[PDB]
Design a protein around this ligand. Structure first.
Ligand code: NA
Length: 279
């Protein structure tokens, strides 16, 4: 299947060169998989989700996304027009407030919540969690991510937007999860993206068009945006039966486009997520 005039990031992940505008993917499109978006929430009613999204838990007064960040990431995972895995089921976990902020203890709890909750959902193809958040190093946060991964959920986390070594950030620095860096439409490491040996893979993260609250859309940038392309990709691949939760991160690195990125510091992988789609 192909999506013509797609957002640049979707085209990039199904291509072997930058500057294309078509997103080629298998029609299964993630059907049967589930992706947890652990963020500000998701505006489930957005037409773009076509009834495939729902809030399952909030750590605040409302289960809603008063910010839009969560909605945006969610859309990159699996919205109709803007998503990687167009037929995936989405679940929202609101650990972030409407200002886009949250305490570690609540983030931890949201993670522990997903590892249990998945037990009562029908996700035949596998389960993915996308965490577009992070702060200063915390072995507790790290350990929460490791548990989530250990439970059988494919965990993808943002590397952080400090133009610094991700080893100093959490959950970015947790080795057992998939740490995602950002790139731009010219195949350059995004100027804000973190780097370092802890990174696993890069994805499109500068100028990413996606859903927004109020039934709108907008373009924003960050490792937050790249994260969902990888989470969406993992769901897609799981559905196809190419890989599993415990082995998605490695598989994506194994089949990525290699050495194509510029501005990559020595010691950081030069790998760009790629779906290897072939008609
Ligand atoms: Na890792």
């Amino acid at each position: 299947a192909a999506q013509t005039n797609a957002p640049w990031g979707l085209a990039r992940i199904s291509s072997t060169s930058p500057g294309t505008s078509t997103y080629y993917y298998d029609e299964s499109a993630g059907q049967g998989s589930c992706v947890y978006v652990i963020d500000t929430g998701i505006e489930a009613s957005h037409p773009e989700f076509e009834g495939r999204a729902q809030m399952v838990k909030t750590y605040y007064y409302s289960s809603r996304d008063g910010n839009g960040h969560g909605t945006h990431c969610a859309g990159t995972v699996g919205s109709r027009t803007y998503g990687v895995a167009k037929k995936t089921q989405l679940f929202g976990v609101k650990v972030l407030d409407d200002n886009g902020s949250g305490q570690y203890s609540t983030i931890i709890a949201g993670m522990d919540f997903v590892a249990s909750d998945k037990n009562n959902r029908n996700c035949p193809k596998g389960v993915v969690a996308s965490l577009s958040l992070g702060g200063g190093y915390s072995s507790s946060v790290n350990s929460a991510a490791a548990r989530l991964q250990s439970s059988g959920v494919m965990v993808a986390v943002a590397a952080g937007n400090n133009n610094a070594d991700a080893r100093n950030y959490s959950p970015a620095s947790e080795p057992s999860v998939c740490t995602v860096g950002a790139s731009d439409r010219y195949d350059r490491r995004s100027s804000f993206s973190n780097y370092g040996s802890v990174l696993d893979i890069f994805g499109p993260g500068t100028s990413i068009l996606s859903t927004w609250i109020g039934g709108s859309t907008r373009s924003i940038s960050g490792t937050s945006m790249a994260t969902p392309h990888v989470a969406g990709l993992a769901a897609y691949l799981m559905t196809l039966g190419k890989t599993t939760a415990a082995s998605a991160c490695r598989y994506i690195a194994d089949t990525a486009n290699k050495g194509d990125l510029s501005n990559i510091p020595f010691g950081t992988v030069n790998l760009l997520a790629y779906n290897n789609y072939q008609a």
